[PDB]
């Protein structure tokens, strides 16, 4: 269940785990998102944001 108290975000390193997928899947659908999450031990919402942020050009001004 939900444990802990909203404090600080994860280590930049984590993101790296995601970048892996996004590398080939520019805009992964839900079915894929939910999955990729179970891999990074993250929910489907936390993963959705990152993507929406990257695709927009927030995570890194230099996107490919």
Question: Can you describe what's shown?
Answer:
This protein is 55% helix and 0% strand. With 64 residues, it is mostly helical. The chain has a single domain (11-57), classed as Homeodomain-like (Arc Repressor Mutant, subunit A, Orthogonal Bundle), CATH 1.10.10.60. Helix 2 (30-40) packs across helix 3. The longest helix is centred in the last third of the chain and has 13 residues, at 44-56. 5% of the residues are buried. Belongs to the delta-EF1/ZFH-1 C2H2-type zinc-finger family.
Secondary structure class reads: mainly alpha
Give the helix tally.
3
User: For the record, what is the CATH homologous superfamily label?
Assistant: Homeodomain-like
DSSP summary, beta strand count: 0
Assigned CATH architecture = Orthogonal Bundle
- What is the 3D shape? globular
CATH topology: Arc Repressor Mutant, subunit A
Which percent range describes the beta-strand content? under 5%
The end-to-end span amounts to: 37 Å
Compressed to H and E, one letter per element, the order equals HHH
Tally the structural domains: 1
Cα radius of gyration in angstroms: 12 Å
Q: Estimate percent helicity.
A: 40-55%
Q: Class, according to the CATH hierarchy?
A: Mainly Alpha
Largest sheet: none
Family: Belongs to the delta-EF1/ZFH-1 C2H2-type zinc-finger family.
Subcellular location: Nucleus
Protein name: Zinc finger E-box-binding homeobox 1
Organism: Homo sapiens
In short:
It is found in: Nucleus. This protein is mostly helical. Helix content is 55%, strand content 0%.
